[PDB]
Scaffold this active site. Structure first.
Site, PDB file in Angstrom:
ATOM      1  N   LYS A   1       0.788  -1.236   0.000  1.00 15.24           N
ATOM      2  CA  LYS A   1       0.000   0.000   0.000  1.00 15.24           C
ATOM      3  C   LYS A   1       0.823   1.292   0.000  1.00 15.24           C
ATOM      4  O   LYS A   1       0.488   2.194  -0.784  1.00 15.24           O
ATOM      5  CB  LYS A   1      -0.991  -0.025   1.171  1.00 15.24           C
ATOM      6  CG  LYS A   1      -1.985   1.116   1.151  1.00 15.24           C
ATOM      7  CD  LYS A   1      -2.632   1.297   2.507  1.00 15.24           C
ATOM      8  CE  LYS A   1      -1.990   2.435   3.276  1.00 15.24           C
ATOM      9  NZ  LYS A   1      -2.356   3.758   2.702  1.00 15.24           N
TER      10      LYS A   1
ATOM     11  N   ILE B   1      -3.521  16.177   1.084  1.00 13.50           N
ATOM     12  CA  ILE B   1      -3.976  14.792   1.106  1.00 13.50           C
ATOM     13  C   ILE B   1      -2.900  13.892   0.512  1.00 13.50           C
ATOM     14  O   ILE B   1      -2.143  14.295  -0.380  1.00 13.50           O
ATOM     15  CB  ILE B   1      -5.310  14.627   0.351  1.00 13.50           C
ATOM     16  CG1 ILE B   1      -6.228  15.847   0.496  1.00 13.50           C
ATOM     17  CG2 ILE B   1      -6.047  13.397   0.830  1.00 13.50           C
ATOM     18  CD1 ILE B   1      -6.622  16.196   1.931  1.00 13.50           C
TER      19      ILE B   1
ATOM     20  N   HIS C   1     -13.189 -22.735  35.462  1.00 17.20           N
ATOM     21  CA  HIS C   1     -13.791 -23.321  36.652  1.00 17.20           C
ATOM     22  C   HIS C   1     -13.879 -24.824  36.435  1.00 17.20           C
ATOM     23  O   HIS C   1     -14.793 -25.317  35.772  1.00 17.20           O
ATOM     24  CB  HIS C   1     -15.158 -22.704  36.921  1.00 17.20           C
ATOM     25  CG  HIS C   1     -15.163 -21.207  36.879  1.00 17.20           C
ATOM     26  ND1 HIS C   1     -14.308 -20.441  37.641  1.00 17.20           N
ATOM     27  CD2 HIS C   1     -15.920 -20.336  36.172  1.00 17.20           C
ATOM     28  CE1 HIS C   1     -14.538 -19.162  37.403  1.00 17.20           C
ATOM     29  NE2 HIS C   1     -15.512 -19.071  36.516  1.00 17.20           N
TER      30      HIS C   1
ATOM     31  N   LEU D   1     -18.012 -18.781  42.533  1.00 17.31           N
ATOM     32  CA  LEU D   1     -18.609 -17.714  43.320  1.00 17.31           C
ATOM     33  C   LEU D   1     -19.348 -16.727  42.425  1.00 17.31           C
ATOM     34  O   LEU D   1     -18.835 -16.310  41.385  1.00 17.31           O
ATOM     35  CB  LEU D   1     -17.523 -16.987  44.116  1.00 17.31           C
ATOM     36  CG  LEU D   1     -17.797 -15.791  45.031  1.00 17.31           C
ATOM     37  CD1 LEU D   1     -19.108 -15.916  45.773  1.00 17.31           C
ATOM     38  CD2 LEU D   1     -16.664 -15.646  46.004  1.00 17.31           C
TER      39      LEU D   1
ATOM     40  N   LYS E   1     -21.141 -12.978  41.618  1.00 21.10           N
ATOM     41  CA  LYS E   1     -20.673 -11.603  41.725  1.00 21.10           C
ATOM     42  C   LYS E   1     -21.689 -10.677  42.377  1.00 21.10           C
ATOM     43  O   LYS E   1     -21.457  -9.467  42.428  1.00 21.10           O
ATOM     44  CB  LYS E   1     -20.307 -11.061  40.342  1.00 21.10           C
ATOM     45  CG  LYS E   1     -18.933 -11.474  39.849  1.00 21.10           C
ATOM     46  CD  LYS E   1     -18.474 -10.580  38.713  1.00 21.10           C
ATOM     47  CE  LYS E   1     -17.057 -10.910  38.286  1.00 21.10           C
ATOM     48  NZ  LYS E   1     -17.017 -12.120  37.424  1.00 21.10           N
TER      49      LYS E   1
ATOM     50  N   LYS F   1     -12.823 -19.538  30.796  1.00 22.29           N
ATOM     51  CA  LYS F   1     -12.792 -18.079  30.768  1.00 22.29           C
ATOM     52  C   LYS F   1     -12.441 -17.606  29.366  1.00 22.29           C
ATOM     53  O   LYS F   1     -11.337 -17.864  28.874  1.00 22.29           O
ATOM     54  CB  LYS F   1     -11.789 -17.537  31.784  1.00 22.29           C
ATOM     55  CG  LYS F   1     -11.324 -16.101  31.541  1.00 22.29           C
ATOM     56  CD  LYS F   1     -12.290 -15.082  32.107  1.00 22.29           C
ATOM     57  CE  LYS F   1     -11.565 -13.824  32.553  1.00 22.29           C
ATOM     58  NZ  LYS F   1     -11.252 -12.930  31.408  1.00 22.29           N
TER      59      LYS F   1
ATOM     60  N   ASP G   1     -31.431  14.159  32.083  1.00 24.01           N
ATOM     61  CA  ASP G   1     -30.136  14.722  32.445  1.00 24.01           C
ATOM     62  C   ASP G   1     -29.226  13.629  32.977  1.00 24.01           C
ATOM     63  O   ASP G   1     -29.622  12.472  33.146  1.00 24.01           O
ATOM     64  CB  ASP G   1     -30.180  15.807  33.522  1.00 24.01           C
ATOM     65  CG  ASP G   1     -31.188  15.531  34.595  1.00 24.01           C
ATOM     66  OD1 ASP G   1     -31.414  14.356  34.923  1.00 24.01           O
ATOM     67  OD2 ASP G   1     -31.641  16.499  35.219  1.00 24.01           O
TER      68      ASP G   1
ATOM     69  N   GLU H   1     -29.436  16.941  26.156  1.00 23.93           N
ATOM     70  CA  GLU H   1     -28.595  18.077  26.506  1.00 23.93           C
ATOM     71  C   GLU H   1     -27.749  18.498  25.310  1.00 23.93           C
ATOM     72  O   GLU H   1     -27.131  17.652  24.657  1.00 23.93           O
ATOM     73  CB  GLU H   1     -27.699  17.705  27.688  1.00 23.93           C
ATOM     74  CG  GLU H   1     -26.964  18.854  28.323  1.00 23.93           C
ATOM     75  CD  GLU H   1     -25.832  18.381  29.218  1.00 23.93           C
ATOM     76  OE1 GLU H   1     -24.910  19.171  29.500  1.00 23.93           O
ATOM     77  OE2 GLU H   1     -25.875  17.213  29.653  1.00 23.93           O
TER      78      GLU H   1
ATOM     79  N   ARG I   1     -29.331  24.575  45.594  1.00 24.44           N
ATOM     80  CA  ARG I   1     -29.216  23.150  45.860  1.00 24.44           C
ATOM     81  C   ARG I   1     -28.277  22.890  47.028  1.00 24.44           C
ATOM     82  O   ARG I   1     -27.389  23.692  47.329  1.00 24.44           O
ATOM     83  CB  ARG I   1     -28.728  22.396  44.620  1.00 24.44           C
ATOM     84  CG  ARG I   1     -27.257  22.541  44.312  1.00 24.44           C
ATOM     85  CD  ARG I   1     -26.850  21.571  43.219  1.00 24.44           C
ATOM     86  NE  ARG I   1     -26.886  20.190  43.685  1.00 24.44           N
ATOM     87  CZ  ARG I   1     -26.879  19.131  42.888  1.00 24.44           C
ATOM     88  NH1 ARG I   1     -26.843  19.258  41.572  1.00 24.44           N
ATOM     89  NH2 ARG I   1     -26.913  17.915  43.425  1.00 24.44           N
TER      90      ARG I   1
ATOM     91  N   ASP J   1     -31.541  16.162  40.823  1.00 23.97           N
ATOM     92  CA  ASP J   1     -31.563  15.505  39.520  1.00 23.97           C
ATOM     93  C   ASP J   1     -32.948  15.573  38.890  1.00 23.97           C
ATOM     94  O   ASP J   1     -33.085  15.846  37.689  1.00 23.97           O
ATOM     95  CB  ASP J   1     -31.122  14.055  39.676  1.00 23.97           C
ATOM     96  CG  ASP J   1     -29.807  13.929  40.401  1.00 23.97           C
ATOM     97  OD1 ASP J   1     -29.720  14.387  41.557  1.00 23.97           O
ATOM     98  OD2 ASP J   1     -28.869  13.346  39.832  1.00 23.97           O
TER      99      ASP J   1
END
Length: 1296
Positions: free
Chosen positions: A51, A303, A789, A796, A798, A849, A897, A982, A1215, A1252
């Site tokens: 390339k 470019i 496992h 266990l 979570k 895993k 928000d 927002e 506030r 809020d």
RNA sequence: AAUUUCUACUCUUGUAGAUGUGAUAAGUGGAAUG
DNA sequence: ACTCCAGTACGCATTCCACTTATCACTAAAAGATCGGAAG
DNA sequence: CTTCCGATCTTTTAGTGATAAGTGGAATGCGTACTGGAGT
């Protein structure tokens, strides 16, 4: 009248689907025996390293062609300055057409059709331009046209390696097509020249001529910085900034020269630095150039040009064995440099040198006090008392000021004693011992294990401990230093300085995500593999699909030995058992395809250059088709708009001639559709007659859905099985999670699209189109340390017994090691505390895993088109939405928000302004996210310093806003409501917000804006609107953040500030900026600008009057609708909320300040009690009800006025927040028309619950303002943003 | 702690959401610590 | 005359890592290169 | 033995309408140091 369900099938969208290919039978064996994967990987590597070599041809041609431009630029300057001064649509169109004709004028140099050049070089440029985008780039005449390019034998052999495989670059080919193009796009070289760099050069020229007319006697300075820099010596300074010099400055070398002239490079300064050097002179010339724009702007890089400063590199160190070899090379560098010997020599000299000549840096001595003593404040206090003993607050202040700057070894030793010296030599001895022990320690063979990471940590920590011990001594010339000792110290410091970058790259390699995601494209020795699915193109593309009892299969038919023989499965009666092969009859879009097979052939073009007799076309036709002059000339004119094109009618205006041309084109293309052998069987009775068409684009958008068909025919099972046994066909199974044997619940959205694409109602009427141009990828196996496992061990969860709150991972690892009886440490107190609340499992089947990366996988990417019956572009989408909104005034509004206590807070309100629903998005799908993000933020530092791998905070915060997406659209569908977000382009948020970074929330608005345009719902029926084949289209297409404005369909944008600090009962907002009340006379002007203050006996609270027509100096410049305000110092009394929980009204929370610095802790105060305690000092009778403010103001007790103004700030503060006790509320200091102050602690459901909720309610109220101003207006348009003053006037108008 | 891929998980050999891919070019910016 | 102190003032520092913004393709068939095998 | 021809595999090629008619654009807060007026 229009319905909300009518916002479907508005425009086509394009999506793509990714799947895993599972090979069946002897497919993988045959592929491995044929060796396709290694060949495709080698071809991908060859393309990757080819390339830049092939891009060098384009770069050389652009540089050679662009130097010949001699086009003057006064006309574009006149166009742009007329457009800047006048600013209408007429000047805008004139500027657009002038930019277009100048882009075409310099594109004529690329295509060799300009009149400024000779005809021979024009013909050469035209020929090389036709050469650049065809197959001669690999071994053709393009290199012989440009003899400057020299190619070695290796790159020529690698160029020849793509023989009969040019189409690999085909898309890349077209990619260079829009580098050299001239049609108004950001990748175009003429667009970069005309609309990007030239306005900046014009701006530079204009500021230069303003500066040289206003301030003379600086032209000589510009001349001598030019000759110091030493470029453009053939012409003067003012000719450089003149317009004809932009005949030059088009190639990128001169761009770099101009940029380094503006900003310098030895440190030879440029035009920028010799102007701020004049600015800092603060004389009259500096003052008159300060008000004048003095910043020259550098030009943009051209470019396709090579990078020269390379920005900042982003070097990440690649592989584990290679960083190990780098560490071996670095360790051999310290071994040959003998750093231990010279460090030891420095240590022996330190016991036999004058310690008064060696100094310590200021910012690190506390760390020395953190090391050599039990606490980091011992050394500074000892020096403080020792300098006290040689003597007062200013005296000790200047004493410590002269202390920390020139910290002396002998002075510190005399200040504290010999304990620091003996600890210092002991620490140096153990540090050098550990450093040499780690230097003698050999490197591990790999880094995949964590103990290898640990020993690398031990070595690097020892070496950086030596570094941090070594950098203690000051070496700068601000204080005296021993010459040889400072020289040796600098030598040892910069002999092993760059190990900080090695440490950081090692940290990144440890922190980085363990998988490999890199995949290379597979081709099976096929150019254009799976480019299209058409039955005629199944020979060459070689990709088909099968369906067998709900399982989808992809079959690719490889090329045979030498020549290739097809399989040609014969169809079988549906009762027999087998696969269901898909037959794909697709004629592409008619706008290019009808001229492709008629009136643009070589035969008809060669015929019509000498004859006017119509030509009969017979091949690939069921009946001969005649083409005459009056139909060939419509598609091939000399002028740029065609007669049937609407641009010709826009330009000249003869509507009847355009109508006859359009009618003749429609009749001809109808005749072609009836006579062409591909489409002779397609029914066209659905088309409107030829005369009743407004434009050709409408006809093509109507005709194109009729030219696409999918059928299915049964193929016998033993035929396919024998094909894949022999090796004639490679059969993969399309696979994802939802096609597994244990599939249990709701499927993915892409599985919904894939299933609904092949539904019978889609086959009858195509609402989803299956696109061609499908890629096949291969991902090799990533080298991983496998974790699983295993069977028979504990495992266990979570989460706790409650499903919302998760477990912190630092505690989770200890708990997981405890329940598996690895143990090896004492159990922590928190673990023992939450042990009854945790839940463990006995494992049933082995869980690997991240199993998807433990083996090499084939992947299949296929695009689809949804709402394909509709047009390809929206037409006045926002006008349609506003028309619906005007017809339906009862639509709710959903305010969004982000907040401090809750990550995303939502409110849904009515058109009357009353609220309907307030909700916190803290907990999503019975899982709290604030707890997870707080835990991650807490242990991020510990995970950083422990060399551990963990997910970031950007991925968690970009994968919680994906969960937020479903709830937002669920509420939007349930309420049939607009949603107001927002406008990040206007406001800026605070540092306490959960979602606080503009990037990962602008991205959330991007996900919400490209989700709502192809909205489908999982539980909806497929036929019903909102299902798979009738998706909701509620938003316009996304183009850019700054270009979409405010309204993007049903999803309004509104400015951020003044939403969270406003009373929702009367609209009272913060009137005073407190940066101007810093002085004593400013405080008395603030008090004298107030009206009057007194006590009332009936309610027992203090009443204060304020008017904004007085006290304008400290007031913020936002006038309000109301002309007066009644500030109420509420009498603090035990009040009760709706549920009966007691609280105390009027409570305020403020930061605590020692004398000038805030500590970060919060004081709770009770303003009424504080002010009555303040006036008890004066002893004035407040119960009389007189104006006590002049009575407090008649005496100049400055401290009393200080607590008076701080008290006023506390009560008028809107506030109140305290994260320790979980308090967050809005308390108002004013009353409404009914005569009560607002307090969110009352927990009234008719009003916002907390800060809020108040912010979301006011954002929804701003959206209500925008919608109401839409309904009052008649133009079906918004206000393109709402100002703060108008919003304040509206909110104080409708609520008072 | 399993995923076309990402995030969070486990009643379930899997769950709930999200999920335009590939190629090229350009602007350069973001985060952390004081 | 000496010392306090409170309002006043000017101007960020280093380190580290990739994030975003525009463009195009989402194609079957015409056209051309090439080649195994047949004609003179 | 030499030259041409239909099969076959790559490549490159045809090209419609139209939209923004604006870009309200942000404002550093924090912090360590300075200096002039007042009390002793």
């Amino acid at each position: 009248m229009t319905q909300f369900e009518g916002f479907t099938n508005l425009y086509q969208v394009s999506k793509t689907l990714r799947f895993e290919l599972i090979p069946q039978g002897k497919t993988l064996k045959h592929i491995q025996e044929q060796g396709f994967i290694e060949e495709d990987k080698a071809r991908n590597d060859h393309y990757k390293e080819l390339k830049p070599i092939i891009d060098r041809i384009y770069k050389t041609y652009a540089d050679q062609c662009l130097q010949l431009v001699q086009l003057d630029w006064e006309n574009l300057s006149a166009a742009i300055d007329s457009y800047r001064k006048e600013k209408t649509e007429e000047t805008r169109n004139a500027l657009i057409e002038e930019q277009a004709t100048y882009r075409n004028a310099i594109h004529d140099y690329f295509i060799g059709r300009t009149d400024n050049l000779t005809d021979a070089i024009n013909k050469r440029h035209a020929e090389i331009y036709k050469g650049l985008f065809k197959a001669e780039l690999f071994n053709g005449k393009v290199l012989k046209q440009l003899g400057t390019v020299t190619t070695t034998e290796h790159e020529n052999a690698l160029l020849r390696s793509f023989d009969k495989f040019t189409t690999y670059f085909s898309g890349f080919y077209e990619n260079r097509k829009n580098v050299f193009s001239a049609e108004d796009i950001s990748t175009a070289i003429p667009h970069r020249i005309v609309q990007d760099n030239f306005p900046k050069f014009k701006e530079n020229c204009h500021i230069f001529t303003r500066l040289i007319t206003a301030v003379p006697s600086l032209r000589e300075h510009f001349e001598n910085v030019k000759k110091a820099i030493g470029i453009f010596v053939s012409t003067s300074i003012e000719e450089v900034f003149s317009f004809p010099f932009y005949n030059q400055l088009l190639t990128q070398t001169q761009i770099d020269l101009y940029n380094q002239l503006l900003g310098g490079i030895e440190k030879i300064k440029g035009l920028n630095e010799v102007l701020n050097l004049a600015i800092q002179k603060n004389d009259e010339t500096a003052h008159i150039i300060a008000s004048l724009p003095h910043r020259f702007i550098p030009l943009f890089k051209q470019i396709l040009s090579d990078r020269n400063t390379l920005s900042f590199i982003l070097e990440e160190f690649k592989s584990d064995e290679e960083v190990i070899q780098s560490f071996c090379k670095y360790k051999t560098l310290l071994r040959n440099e003998n750093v231990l010997e010279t460090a030891e020599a420095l240590f022996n000299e330190l016991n036999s040198i004058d310690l008064t000549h060696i100094f310590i840096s200021h910012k690190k001595l506390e760390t020395i006090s953190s090391a050599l003593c039990d606490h980091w404040d011992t050394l500074r206090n000892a020096l403080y008392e020792r300098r006290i003993s040689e003597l007062k607050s200013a005296k000790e202040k200047v004493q410590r000021s002269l202390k920390h700057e020139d910290i002396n070894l002998q002075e510190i030793i005399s200040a504290a004693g010999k304990e620091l010296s003996e600890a210092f030599k002991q620490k140096t001895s153990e540090i050098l011992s550990h450093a040499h022990a780690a230097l003698d320690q050999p490197l591990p063979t790999t880094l995949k294990k964590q103990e290898e990471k640990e020993i690398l940590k031990s070595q690097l920590d020892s070496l950086l401990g030596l570094y941090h011990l070594l950098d203690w001594f000051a070496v700068d010339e601000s204080n005296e230093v021993d010459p040889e000792f400072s020289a040796r110290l600098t030598g040892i410091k910069l002999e092993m300085e760059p190990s900080l970058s090695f440490y950081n790259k090692a940290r990144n390699y440890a922190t980085k995500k363990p998988y490999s995601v890199e995949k290379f494209k597979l081709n099976f020795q096929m150019p254009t593999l799976a480019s299209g699915w058409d039955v005629n193109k199944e020979k060459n593309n070689g990709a088909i699909l099968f369906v067998k009892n709900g399982l989808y299969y992809l079959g690719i038919m490889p090329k045979q030995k030498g020549r290739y023989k097809a399989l040609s499965f014969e169809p079988t009666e549906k009762t027999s058992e087998g696969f269901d092969k898909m037959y794909y009859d697709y004629f592409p879009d008619a706008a290019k395809m009808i001229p492709k097979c008629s009136t643009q052939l070589k035969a008809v073009t060669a015929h019509f250059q000498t004859h006017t007799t119509p030509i009969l076309l017979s091949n690939n036709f069921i009946e001969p088709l005649e083409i005459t002059k009056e139909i060939y000339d419509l598609n091939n004119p000399e002028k740029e708009p065609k007669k049937f094109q609407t641009a010709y009618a826009k330009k000249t205006g003869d509507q009847k001639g355009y109508r006859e041309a359009l009618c003749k084109w429609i009749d001809f293309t109808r005749d072609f559709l009836s006579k062409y052998t591909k489409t002779t069987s397609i029914d066209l009775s659905s088309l409107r007659p030829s005369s009743q068409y407004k434009d050709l684009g409408e006809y093509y958008a109507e005709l194109n859905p009729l030219l696409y068909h999918i059928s299915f025919q049964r193929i016998a099972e033993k035929e396919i099985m024998d094909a894949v046994e022999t090796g004639k066909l490679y059969l993969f199974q399309i696979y994802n999670k939802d096609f597994a044997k244990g599939h249990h619940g709701k499927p993915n959205l892409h599985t919904l699209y894939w299933t609904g694409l092949f539904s019978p109602e889609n086959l009858a009427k195509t609402s989803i189109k299956l696109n061609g141009q499908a890629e096949l990828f291969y991902r090799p196996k990533s080298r991983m340390k496998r974790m699983a496992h295993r069977l028979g061990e504990k495992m266990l969860n979570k989460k706790l017994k409650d499903q919302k709150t998760p477990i912190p991972d630092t505690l989770y690892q200890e708990l997981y090691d405890y329940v598996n009886h690895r143990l090896s440490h004492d159990l922590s107190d928190e673990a023992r505390a939450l042990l009854p609340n945790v839940i463990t499992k006995e494992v049933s089947h082995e869980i690997i895993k991240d199993r998807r990366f433990t083996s090499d996988k084939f992947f299949f990417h296929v695009p689809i088109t949804l709402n394909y019956q509709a047009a390809n572009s929206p037409s006045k989408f926002n006008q349609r939405v506003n028309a619906y909104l005007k017809e339906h005034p009862e639509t709710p509004i959903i305010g969004i928000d982000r907040g401090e206590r809750n990550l995303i807070y939502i409110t849904v309100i009515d058109s009357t302004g009353k609220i309907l629903e307030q909700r916190s998005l803290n907990t999503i799908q019975q899982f709290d996210y604030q707890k997870k993000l707080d835990n991650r933020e807490k242990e991020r530092v510990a995970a950083r310093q422990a060399w551990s791998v963990v997910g970031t905070i950007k991925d968690l915060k970009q994968g919680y806003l994906s969960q937020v997406i479903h709830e937002i659209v669920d509420l939007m569908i349930h309420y049939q409501a607009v949603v107001v977000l927002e406008n990040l382009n206007f406001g800026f948020k605070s540092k306490r917000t959960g979602i606080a970074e503009k990037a990962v929330y602008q991205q959330f608005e991007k996900m919400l804006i490209d989700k709502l345009n192809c909205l489908v719902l999982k539980d909806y029926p497929a036929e019903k609107v909102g299902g798979v084949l009738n998706p909701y289209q509620l938003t316009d297409q996304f183009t850019s953040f700054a270009k979409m404005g405010t309204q993007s369909g049903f999803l309004f944008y509104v400015p951020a500030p003044y939403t969270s600090k406003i009373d929702p009962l009367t609209g009272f907002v913060d009137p005073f900026v407190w940066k101007t009340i810093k002085n004593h006379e400013s405080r008395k002007h603030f008090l004298e600008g107030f009206d009057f203050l007194h006590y009332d006996v009936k309610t027992g609270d203090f009443i204060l009057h304020f008017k904004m027509n007085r006290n304008l100096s400290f007031q913020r410049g936002l006038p309000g609708f109301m002309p007066a305000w009644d500030i109420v110092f509420e009498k603090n009394e035990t009040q009760f909320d709706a549920k009966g929980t007691p609280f105390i009204a009027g409570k305020r929370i403020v930061p605590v300040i020692e004398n000038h610095r805030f500590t970060g802790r919060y004081r709770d105060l009770y303003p009424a009690n504080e002010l009555i305690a303040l006036l008890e000092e004066k002893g004035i009778v407040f119960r009389d009800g007189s104006n006590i403010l002049p009575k407090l103001l008649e005496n100049d007790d400055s401290h009393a006025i200080d607590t008076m103004v701080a008290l006023i700030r506390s009560v008028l503060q809107m506030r109140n927040s305290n994260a320790a006790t979980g308090e967050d509320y809005i308390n108002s200091p004013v009353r409404d028309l009914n005569g009560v102050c607002f307090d969110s602690r009352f927990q009234n459901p008719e009003w916002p619950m907390d800060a809020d909720a108040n912010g979301a309610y006011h954002i929804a109220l701003k959206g209500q303002l925008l919608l109401n101003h839409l309904k009052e207006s008649k133009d079906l348009k918004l206000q393109n943003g709402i100002s703060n003053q108008d919003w304040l006037a509206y909110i104080q108008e409708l609520r008072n």
